[PDB]
């Protein structure tokens, strides 16, 4: 479980304060992105009218700081659930970057921040139910999740809230929530979660690459038959994109994706019969095919 | 929530460089006008098998050492060897040098590793110094010179530089003075470590974490003395718990209202009976690479 180095993102974190409400923002070029609920009072958060709340706001009500150095706001706008604050200085540490929306099952690093200061970095997976099992306390909103490909930071998550069950929910960098949630201090519940099949399969491939292959059988299956059985075990169905991203591991091992699926199916139907895989009786579902290839 | 969390690695990323000698390439740490790297970068194929490092080193010149920081070569103007690390004096100071210190950690302590290849950061993860002085890392060919570290305030405490992988797949290395953790040597020979044990005070800290996060099926009403717990612990190849350890757990005991020795009673029941298919914080094994401080910080 390995995070991306966080330095390129650390160089982009700032704090944003309205009155006494402070959270984190992301400073890229001359724009700071943050959760729109920074403009909320305690009682505004019960059920906020964000449009009305923002109409009462001016550039001069937003305190943006990098460290203790203030950054002057020269314009503001709301895009879905994120506030965009134009500032008078371009971040000299701006990396090459992209905003992306990730699929359930994908992993990303989270730079957990408080008051604009990074406290830690960890690797997360987006669950099928569009929550993440984060580690976030009060003041963490506006922390971001990201991948780094080559030199380019792909920003995929901004943190907004904790659900009753202790899991976390947020948006992409365009302010669109992952999943059915809304930024209201109201009662909300994640759907029942399911196992990320594509990742379990990646894990089995990883086990084969390391010589652990007792679970391979001489059978195969159709993708549709597999998907129908998997759902009976609370496993996600596979998509064509999943079959494709397993390509490199399939090529590396010589084991066809649908043969590995027949192997997983047999594991689901017969259990582990007491044996282990990569030193464990549980199947891991938070390593993507990309993650396996990275560490191998 | 709960997650294995690493320190942010920006301060260390700004110190990593590539070092090359012959056909050997690994990573170096550039602080002020010195680059630190594992000394076996001066070795060849033949050499690694049984190197006489002082002999190999006196036969080198400054210009046998190629240091690259990004696209930019740094010129080496001096070199010395301190135990198993080589110190390269360069004609340029690193402007990104953080406040730092060199520390030797104790077994059971945790630190973050910034894994690097050819002088470029690739990933960060949390490790602990095992009781047998190995670390269960993720290091591939080319990762030597990668460092482990803790951050307090704005200060980076470097505690580990990476040198090798043992046949079992665990890893070994040195502090930044070049002294190995454990009975290992920087020679290309198969080496075994002593028998490992589980870091008990960290297992307890992680059980407290599981209670803070509302996961508590393993608690019980039993109790135990410190010495009667340590007897069972040692039987199962767990480290003894000291009174200092009990004290260190105080804040976590206070937060949860579970006295340390009651948590020891829970752990004792888990050791003797096991988990019977159950899981704590999502694990089917007792985790021992979270310290009390790691739990407090994050919760
Ligand atoms: C923004 O920092 C904050 C992060 C929450 C707080 C504790 N852990 C988190 O992940 N977000 C909120 O407080 C959010 C605001 C709404 C307008 C969306 N409401 C929320 O998360 O309520 C749940 C909660 C649980 C425990 C403590 C505080 C809040
Ligand atoms: C330095 O980058 C390298 C790191 C090893 C290579 C594989 N994983 C690692 O962590 N260290 C060595 O190659 C070391 C050099 C001696 C002179 C100390 N030898 C070593 O670790 O041998 C084991 C090995 C296993 C798998 C591939 C290559 C080497």
Residue numbers in the entry:
A (entry chain B): 5 to 300
B (entry chain A): 2 to 300
What did the published study say regarding this structure?
The SARS-CoV-2 genome encodes two polyproteins which are processed by a 3C-like protease (3CLpro) and a papain-like protease. These viral proteases are essential for viral replication, making them attractive targets for drug development (5–7). Therefore, we generated three deuterated variants of GC376 by replacing hydrogen with deuterium at the metabolic soft spots encompassed in the R-site (aromatic ring and benzylic carbon) and evaluated their activity in the enzyme- and the cell-based assays.
Compound 2 with a bisulfite adduct warhead and compound 5 with α-ketoamide were cocrystallized with the 3CLpro of SARS-CoV-2 and SARS-CoV and examined by X-ray crystallography. Examination of the active site of SARS-CoV-2 3CLpro revealed the presence of prominent difference electron density consistent with compound 2 covalently bound to the Sγ atom of Cys145 in each subunit. Interestingly, the electron density was most consistent with the S-enantiomer at the newly formed stereocenter. Although the electron density in subunit B did contain a small “bulge” that may be due to the R-enantiomer, only one configuration was modeled. Compound 2 adopts the same binding mode in each subunit and forms identical hydrogen bond interactions with residues Phe140, His163, His164, Glu166, and Gln189. Notably, the hydroxyl in compound 2 bound to SARS-CoV-2 3CLpro is 3.38 Å and 3.39 Å from the N-atom of Ser144, which would be a weak hydrogen bond contact. Crystal structures of deuterated GC376 (compound 2) and the 3CLpro of SARS-CoV-2 revealed that deuteration did not alter the interactions between GC376 and 3CLpro which are reported by other groups. It may be speculated that the enhanced activity of the deuterated compounds can be attributed to tighter binding to the target, which was observed with other deuterated compounds, or improved physicochemical properties of the compound. The 50% effective concentration (EC50) values of the tested deuterated compounds (compounds 1, 2, 6, and 7) (0.068 to 0.086 µM) were comparable in those cell lines and lower than GC376 by 2.67∼3.38-fold in Vero E6 cells.
